[PDB]
Enzyme design. Structure first.
Site, mmCIF file in Angstrom:
data_model
loop_
_atom_site.group_PDB
_atom_site.id
_atom_site.type_symbol
_atom_site.label_atom_id
_atom_site.label_comp_id
_atom_site.label_asym_id
_atom_site.label_seq_id
_atom_site.Cartn_x
_atom_site.Cartn_y
_atom_site.Cartn_z
ATOM 1 N N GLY A 196 -79.247 -5.193 1.302
ATOM 2 C CA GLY A 196 -78.739 -3.857 1.104
ATOM 3 C C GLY A 196 -79.802 -2.901 0.604
ATOM 4 O O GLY A 196 -80.761 -3.296 -0.065
ATOM 5 N N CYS B 56 -82.823 -11.253 0.796
ATOM 6 C CA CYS B 56 -83.483 -10.005 0.417
ATOM 7 C C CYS B 56 -82.883 -9.400 -0.848
ATOM 8 O O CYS B 56 -83.336 -9.702 -1.956
ATOM 9 C CB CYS B 56 -83.423 -9.010 1.577
ATOM 10 S SG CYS B 56 -84.226 -9.626 3.070
ATOM 11 N N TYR B 57 -81.872 -8.540 -0.703
ATOM 12 C CA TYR B 57 -81.223 -7.999 -1.893
ATOM 13 C C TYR B 57 -80.457 -9.078 -2.643
ATOM 14 O O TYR B 57 -80.284 -8.978 -3.863
ATOM 15 C CB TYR B 57 -80.293 -6.843 -1.528
ATOM 16 C CG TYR B 57 -79.702 -6.152 -2.741
ATOM 17 C CD1 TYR B 57 -80.477 -5.309 -3.529
ATOM 18 C CD2 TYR B 57 -78.374 -6.347 -3.100
ATOM 19 C CE1 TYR B 57 -79.945 -4.678 -4.641
ATOM 20 C CE2 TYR B 57 -77.832 -5.718 -4.209
ATOM 21 C CZ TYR B 57 -78.622 -4.885 -4.977
ATOM 22 O OH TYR B 57 -78.087 -4.260 -6.081
ATOM 23 N N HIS C 255 -85.255 -11.530 6.387
ATOM 24 C CA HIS C 255 -83.961 -11.541 7.054
ATOM 25 C C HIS C 255 -83.952 -12.631 8.118
ATOM 26 O O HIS C 255 -84.552 -12.448 9.188
ATOM 27 C CB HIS C 255 -83.662 -10.178 7.682
ATOM 28 C CG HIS C 255 -83.212 -9.140 6.701
ATOM 29 N ND1 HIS C 255 -81.919 -9.077 6.229
ATOM 30 C CD2 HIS C 255 -83.878 -8.118 6.115
ATOM 31 C CE1 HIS C 255 -81.810 -8.065 5.387
ATOM 32 N NE2 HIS C 255 -82.984 -7.467 5.300
ATOM 33 N N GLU D 31 -81.481 -13.474 9.981
ATOM 34 C CA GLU D 31 -80.399 -13.242 10.929
ATOM 35 C C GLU D 31 -80.785 -12.320 12.079
ATOM 36 O O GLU D 31 -80.010 -12.196 13.034
ATOM 37 C CB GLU D 31 -79.175 -12.661 10.207
ATOM 38 C CG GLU D 31 -79.347 -11.230 9.714
ATOM 39 C CD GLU D 31 -79.961 -11.143 8.328
ATOM 40 O OE1 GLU D 31 -80.825 -11.981 8.001
ATOM 41 O OE2 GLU D 31 -79.570 -10.238 7.560
ATOM 42 N N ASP E 84 -60.974 -8.618 26.780
ATOM 43 C CA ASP E 84 -60.259 -8.895 25.539
ATOM 44 C C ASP E 84 -58.752 -8.930 25.762
ATOM 45 O O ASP E 84 -58.070 -9.864 25.322
ATOM 46 C CB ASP E 84 -60.626 -7.853 24.482
ATOM 47 C CG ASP E 84 -62.106 -7.858 24.149
ATOM 48 O OD1 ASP E 84 -62.823 -8.758 24.636
ATOM 49 O OD2 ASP E 84 -62.554 -6.959 23.405
ATOM 50 N N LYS F 208 -66.989 -11.104 20.231
ATOM 51 C CA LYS F 208 -66.839 -10.888 21.667
ATOM 52 C C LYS F 208 -67.250 -12.120 22.465
ATOM 53 O O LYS F 208 -66.569 -12.500 23.425
ATOM 54 C CB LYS F 208 -67.652 -9.669 22.101
#
Lengths: 535, 518
Positions: free
Chosen positions: A61, A88-89, A182, A184, A241, A391
Site C-alpha cells: 500500500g 512490501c507494506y 511484489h 504477484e 459469464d 473470470k
C-alpha cells in the site's frame, strides 16, 4: 459438511488489503497455483471471520507505517498462530507490530527490477523454505519505499539484493516472513513459486482447489439452497459469464430454472438466434427470448447525453425483465410451484472492488438495480453461484459443464450492446452501420489467428462528420472507431500491436463495404489512462 | 508574358481520363524536360506553343465504342514524335490503322516481364527501349492489348503473354506501349520517358528551378510594372513563403504580405512565422489579429461546409480591408494595390482541366507558381536562400485548426487541439520522422468518451491523430508508426492535455479517404 462455503471446505489463504493496486493479483496467483484464497481490507477484525485461514498475507500500500493515519491490520494477525507473509507494506507492518522500532527507511515510493539472491543460513549453504527453487538470480519487482535499514527485533535475513541487505526477513521461531518486493506481478516471474512455498510448504495448505472438484460441490450447494420444488429466474445474454451460470443452474434443478434473453435491438447480426440455439438446444436451458428492439430504440431517439443513455438502458431492461418475470411466475403458478430465487452473475472481482481498501476513508455499505427489483417488488431471494470465482475460473467451470471451448473464449459483450458502442444518440441505422463494421473487424481478427490474443475487440460508430471522395463529389459521412486491447495482469491493458498492413486493409474494407463510413480510426489509448469501452 | 511553354522544349501530354496522367508530366519534370498536360478535347491549332512532342495518356475507355474519346486528328501531322500510352495506343491504332485491332478484353492491370524486340541479326532494338533491353518490369494494362499490328507499325517490345506490348511506325515517329511508364510499378519508366523526350523528340533537358528563378523574377516585374503594388497572404507554409519570397525578390517593398491570425494557428506560430518572414527573409509583412472575428462568427455553425464558406468569406474581407488600408497610407504616395498573390500550383490547374468524361460538362491575380509541382517549389525556395528546414515543413491549410475541429469550432476546442498537436508533432520530430511524413496534425472530436479521473468516471472529448506518407498529390497512406510510439504518444496526450479522454489514430488511406478531416 455443515457449511458448503469454499472458504469453509478448502484450505484458505487470507490476504489483508492495505491499498496496493497489486493486491488482487495475490489472490489470483494463489488460485492459479491451486490454493483457494480470499481477500479482505486491513480493517477486518479477524475474530469475526467465519473460517480459520491457514495463512495470512499482508499486501502492500502507498503508505509509511509510522505516519499519521497509517493503516494497520488487526494486532491478532501475529497472535493467531498461522504463518504471516508481509508484502512490501506488510513488511513495514511486521516491523511496526513486532519490532516496535522505526527501522523503515523513508525512501520515496519507487519501483524497479532487481536481482535477488537467497541468504545462505549455514556453512553448508541452506536457504529458507520461502525461497525453495528461488535460490539464485531471481528477478523481482522491488518496492524501494519499503526498505529496511535494520533487522526488526527477532528477525534474520533470508534474501538479499545489491542495494537492499534485508530484502527478505524471517522470524527466528515464529512463521513470520517479510519481503520488500511484489511476488504477484509479472515483473516478478518466479513469484508464483514463492507464493506456493508460503501457502503449501509453510502453511501446510492443500492445493486441491480446482474447477474439476468445485462443479459437483457447487451443484450440491445450489440444490440444497433452492430445494426440490422452488423455481429460479435468471438473465442470459450469450456472454461467457451468464452462460456458465445458467448452465450450472440447469445441471442442478433442470427445467425449474428459467433463463430470459432480452434483445435490446443492439445485438450483433443473428446473435439473438445463435445464442438461443446454443442455450435452448445445445445446452438444454429452459430459455425465453423477449424482443424489446422497438421499445429500446424508440426511447433512445433523441438521447444525446451518454449518462442519460445508460440510465434508459438499465431502467427499460428492468421494466422489460420484470414483465417477463411476472409472466413466468404465472406459468409456475399453474404448475404448483413458485419462483423464489433470482440468478445474478456476480463474480468475485466484483466484490473485490466493493471491499478494496481505499485508505483512511469510509467503509462503504448497502447490490444492483435489477436484483433490487426482484427482491422487493417480486419477493425473490438472490443466488450468486459465481461470487467466489475469477473470470478464468468461470471459463474452466464451463468446460467442466460440457460447454464448447470456443464459447468460453468469446470476448465480453456489454449489456446495452451496440447502444454503448454508438457515441451519442442511438438510431437503428447507426446500430446497423456499427454492427456491419464490427462484423468485418472481428472476422479479419479471427481469420488472422488473433482472436485468442485480444482481450476485447469491437467497432464503434462516431456521429462526427469526416469527408470522403465519392467519385467526384465531396461526401460527409460518419466515422468508425476500431478498438482492441490485450490485458496485462487483469489490468494495464494496451492497444493490440496490430501489423500496420492489417489495420489499413481492414480500414479499406470497412469504408468500401459499409455505407455511411468516411473514415476508420484505431483507438490507441491504453487502459490505465482511458477505459476499454467507449461509454 | 513569356511562359515556360515558350522558353523551354515542352512535351505536351493529352489526358484521356486516367488517374495516372499527371504522373507522366511529373516524370518528365524530374528528368529535366518541362511539360504540360491538357484534356484530349484540346484543339491543337489553338495552342499558344509548339510542343516538342506529344504523349497520349491512358483512360477508362475503348476507342471503337460509342462516345469514345478522341484527340485532335492534327496530333499525327504536327511533325513531332507521338507516344501513345495504353489508351493512346488504341487511338494510334484507330487513327492510323483504320481497323479494329484492339482485343476489347477486361480492363485489368498487373505486372509483367517485358523484353525488347531484337530488330537485326545483331541485337539492335528501338532506341525508345535503349537501356531497357531485357527484363523490364512494367505495369501492363491488359485491356489495351492488340490482336494485330496496326497498319504501318511493327513490334519493338514483347511480354510473354502479349506479342505487341510495344509498337513503332515503319518511318514516322509514332510509338505505342501497352503499359504505364509513369507509375512506380515500372521502376524503369523514367528511362523510357527520357528516351522519348530527349533522344526521340530532341527536347533539351535543361528545365531546372535554378534557371527558373531569374526567368520568373523578370516575368513578374514585367507583369506588375515598376509602380504597381501587389498584395499577398502568408501562412508560414512552404507554398506561401516561397511565393512571398519570390515576389519580394521581384518588386521589393511594393509587395505586401499579410499574416492573418484567425485564432486557429499552432502554438506561438503567429510570432515564429512573423520573425521568419519579416526578419530572416526581409518581406514587407503586416499582421492582422482577426482571432475574435473568426471565432465569434464560427459559433453556432455545425455544418462543415458552412464553416468553410464563412472562413473563406471573412478571409477575403480581411484582405480587401487590408488593401484599402495600405492605399490610404500617406507614406505610400498614391500607391495602388492592383494585384493579389495566390500560391496556386500546377496540380490545382490539373484538377480543373483533367479529362473526366465524354460529356465534358475585383483585384487582379498573379500566380507565379501555377506551373510547378510540390518538389519544384521546395527547390525554388532553396534557390531563393530559404533555409532547408523552412522548405521541408508540412503544409498548413488556410483555415488551420478550424477544419481540425469536427463540427462546431470554439476557442476551447481549438486550444485543446492546439495543445494535442504540439505533442504529436514534437514526438514525430524527436523520433526523426518529420521528413518521412507528408502531413501530420491532431484534430479534436467533440464526441464524448468515458475516462477515469482518480476513480470517478468522466466524459471528455476525443483527439484524432493523422499522419500520412504521400508521393503523388492523389496518393497517400497512413504512416506506419511503431505501435510503441503511438501508445506512448496516446498516454502522454491524455495526461498533459485537459478535456481529452481518448486518442485515436486515423488509418484511412487516400485512395479511399482524404488527408484533412473536413
Amino acid at each position: 459438511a455443515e457449511e458448503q462455503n469454499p472458504s469453509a471446505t478448502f484450505d484458505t489463504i487470507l490476504t489483508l488489503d492495505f491499498g496496493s493496486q497489486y493486491t488482487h493479483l495475490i489472490t489470483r496467483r494463489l488460485r492459479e497455483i491451486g490454493v483457494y484464497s480470499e481477500m479482505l481490507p486491513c480493517t477486518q477484525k479477524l475474530a469475526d471471520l467465519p473460517f480459520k485461514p491457514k495463512g495470512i498475507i499482508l499486501s502492500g500500500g502507498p503508505y509509511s507505517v509510522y505516519e499519521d493515519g497509517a493503516p494497520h491490520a488487526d494486532p491478532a494477525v501475529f497472535e493467531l498462530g498461522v504463518p504471516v507473509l508481509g508484502i512490501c507494506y506488510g513488511l513495514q507492518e511486521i516491523a511496526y507490530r513486532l519490532g516496535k522500532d522505526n527501522v523503515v527507511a523513508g525512501t520515496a515510493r519507487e519501483y524497479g527490477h532487481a536481482d535477488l539472491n537467497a541468504q545462505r543460513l549455514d556453512n553448508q549453504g541452506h536457504v529458507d523454505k520461502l525461497f525453495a527453487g528461488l535460490e539464485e538470480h531471481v528477478k523481482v519487482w522491488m518496492s524501494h519505499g519499503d526498505k529496511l535499514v535494520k533487522l526488526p527485533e527477532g528477525f534474520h535475513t533470508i534474501a538479499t539484493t545489491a542495494n537492499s541487505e534485508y530484502a527478505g526477513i524471517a522470524h527466528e521461531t515464529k512463521p513470520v516472513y517479510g519481503i520488500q518486493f511484489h511476488p504477484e506481478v509479472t515483473h516478478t516471474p518466479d513469484g508464483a513459486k514463492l507464493l506456493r512455498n508460503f501457502a503449501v510448504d509453510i502453511c501446510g495448505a492443500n492445493p486441491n482447489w480446482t474447477m474439476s472438484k468445485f462443479v459437483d460441490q457447487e451443484i450440491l450447494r445450489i440444490r440444497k439452497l433452492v430445494g426440490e420444488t422452488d423455481h429460479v429466474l435468471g438473465a442470459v445474454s450469450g456472454g461467457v459469464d451468464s452462460t456458465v451460470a445458467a448452465k450450472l443452474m440447469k445441471e442442478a434443478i433442470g427445467d425449474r430454472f428459467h433463463a430470459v434473453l432480452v434483445n435490446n435491438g443492439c445485438m450483433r447480426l443473428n446473435e439473438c438466434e445463435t445464442v438461443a440455439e446454443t442455450l435452448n438446444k445445445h445446452l438444454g436451458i429452459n430459455l425465453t427470448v423477449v424482443d424489446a428492439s422497438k421499445r429500446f430504440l424508440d426511447g433512445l431517439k433523441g438521447v444525446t447525453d451518454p449518462e442519460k443513455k445508460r440510465m434508459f438502458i438499465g431502467a427499460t431492461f428492468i421494466d422489460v425483465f420484470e414483465e417477463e418475470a411476472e409472466k413466468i411466475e404465472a406459468l409456475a403458478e399453474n404448475s404448483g410451484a413458485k419462483v423464489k430465487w433470482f440468478l445474478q452473475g456476480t463474480l468475485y472481482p466484483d466484490v473485490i472492488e466493493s471491499i478494496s481498501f481505499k485508505g483512511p476513508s469510509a467503509t462503504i455499505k448497502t447490490v444492483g438495480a435489477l436484483p433490487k427489483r426482484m427482491i422487493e417488488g417480486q419477493g425473490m431471494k438472490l443466488i450468486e453461484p459465481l461470487r467466489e470465482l475469477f473470470k478464468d475460473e468461470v471459463r474452466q467451470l464451463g468446460r467442466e459443464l460440457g460447454i464448447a471451448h470456443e464459447l468460453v473464449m468469446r470476448h465480453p459483450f456489454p449489456g446495452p450492446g451496440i447502444a454503448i458502442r454508438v457515441l451519442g444518440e442511438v438510431t437503428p441505422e447507426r446500430v446497423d452501420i456499427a454492427r456491419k463494421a464490427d462484423h468485418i473487424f472481428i472476422s479479419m481478427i479471427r481469420e488472422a489467428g488473433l482472436y485468442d490474443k485480444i482481450s476485447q475487440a469491437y467497432a464503434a460508430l462516431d456521429p462526427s462528420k469526416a469527408v470522403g471522395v465519392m467519385g467526384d463529389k465531396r461526401v460527409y459521412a460518419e466515422i468508425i472507431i476500431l478498438r482492441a486491447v490485450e490485458t496485462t495482469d487483469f489490468m494495464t491493458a494496451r492497444a493490440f500491436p496490430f501489423d500496420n498492413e492489417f489495420l489499413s486493409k481492414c480500414a479499406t474494407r470497412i469504408i468500401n463495404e459499409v455505407h455511411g463510413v468516411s473514415r476508420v480510426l484505431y483507438d490507441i489509448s491504453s487502459k490505465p489512462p482511458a477505459t476499454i469501452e467507449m461509454e
